[PDB]
């Protein structure tokens, strides 16, 4: 299937004393493989998947160098943004940056991303063409001019179209045993009776990977969204994911309803019926 690599960075200012709390994480698809946390003792980029541990000490030194440079950039940012927005030194504020690349089934470049937020609002983002910027307000416009003059888009496009995809292919190869394996959902249905006349049917999908999935109900072969509840997909904690969808039905009419499951790891969609 298609693949991605994404890096996520959060910095949170700490009024009164010291530098911001900084947390960086790297992902391949839905698998976290690296982390840096300013509050941790090692002060190094750290492995979070077995397959990245194959990398030598020079990988770790270079990643540590870059992640620390990212955190200083964000440190400076928090001060500049405080000034841009006319804010005091009393409040805690947040900067967030995400970047990375998407590749299709052929592992060739599809899309690249680099976007930035301040206090949880859109600030500046690289446009799909990797040549121009979307600045949300006048402060971000000032940043856009700064980044244009310094040719930031050109540097980023080179990374996203080349380096990002090159290393993605590397990680997918090295981590093939997990990263290239799909785990089809394990599915089952539960029944609960709220009253004499009403029942709840819950359709479960467990232990699946990747996270992307579609779960739906049909009544007598037609889509049913009314009287249904769908929970957010959630991590099991062992690298896999869980989801359920539930429908409220008249008691005795259970057999009319079917649950439909679409996932990359299923050659064909799955159908479940209450037995």
């Amino acid at each position: 299937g298609s693949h991605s690599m994404r890096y996520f960075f959060t910095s949170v200012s700490r009024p009164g004393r010291g530098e911001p709390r900084f947390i960086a994480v790297g992902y391949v698809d839905d698998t976290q493989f690296v982390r840096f946390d300013s509050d941790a003792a090692s002060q190094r980029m750290e492995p979070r998947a077995p397959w990245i541990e194959q990398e030598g000490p020079e990988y770790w030194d270079g990643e540590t160098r870059k992640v620390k440079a990212h955190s200083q950039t964000h440190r400076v940012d928090l001060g500049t943004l405080r000034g841009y927005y006319n804010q005091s030194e009393a409040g805690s504020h947040t900067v967030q940056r995400m970047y990375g690349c998407d590749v299709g089934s052929d592992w060739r470049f599809l899309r690249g991303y680099h976007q930035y937020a301040y206090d949880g609002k859109d600030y500046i983002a690289l446009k799909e063409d990797l040549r121009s910027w979307t600045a949300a307000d006048m402060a971000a416009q000032t940043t856009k001019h700064k980044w244009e003059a310094a040719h930031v888009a050109e540097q980023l496009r080179a990374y996203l179209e080349g380096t990002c995809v090159e290393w993605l292919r590397r990680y997918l190869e090295n981590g093939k045993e997990t990263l290239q394996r799909t785990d089809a959902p394990k599915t089952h249905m539960t029944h609960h009776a709220v009253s004499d006349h009403e029942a709840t049917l819950r359709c479960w999908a467990l232990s699946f990977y990747p996270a992307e999935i579609t779960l739906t109900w049909q009544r007598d072969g037609e889509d049913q969204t009314q009287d249904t509840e769908l929970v957010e997909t959630r991590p099991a904690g062992d690298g896999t994911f869980q989801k359920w969808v539930a429908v409220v039905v008249p008691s005795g009419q259970e057999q009319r309803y079917t649950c439909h499951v679409q996932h990359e790891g299923l050659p064909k969609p799955l159908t479940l019926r209450w037995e």
């Binding site: 890096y7 790297g26 990988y59 270079g62 990643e63 870059k66 992640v67 440079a69 990212h70 950039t73 400076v76 940012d77 500049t80 943004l81 841009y84 940056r97 970047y99 680099h114 930035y116 600030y123 500046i124 940043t143 700064k146 980044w147 310094a150 930031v152 888009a153 050109e154 540097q155 980023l156 080179a158 990374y159 380096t163 990002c164 290393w167």
Partner: peptide, 10 residues
């Protein structure tokens, strides 16, 4: 692998 260049202050 993280980006080197192109990560600039606002």
């Amino acid at each position: 692998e993280l980006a080197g260049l192109g990560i600039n202050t606002v």
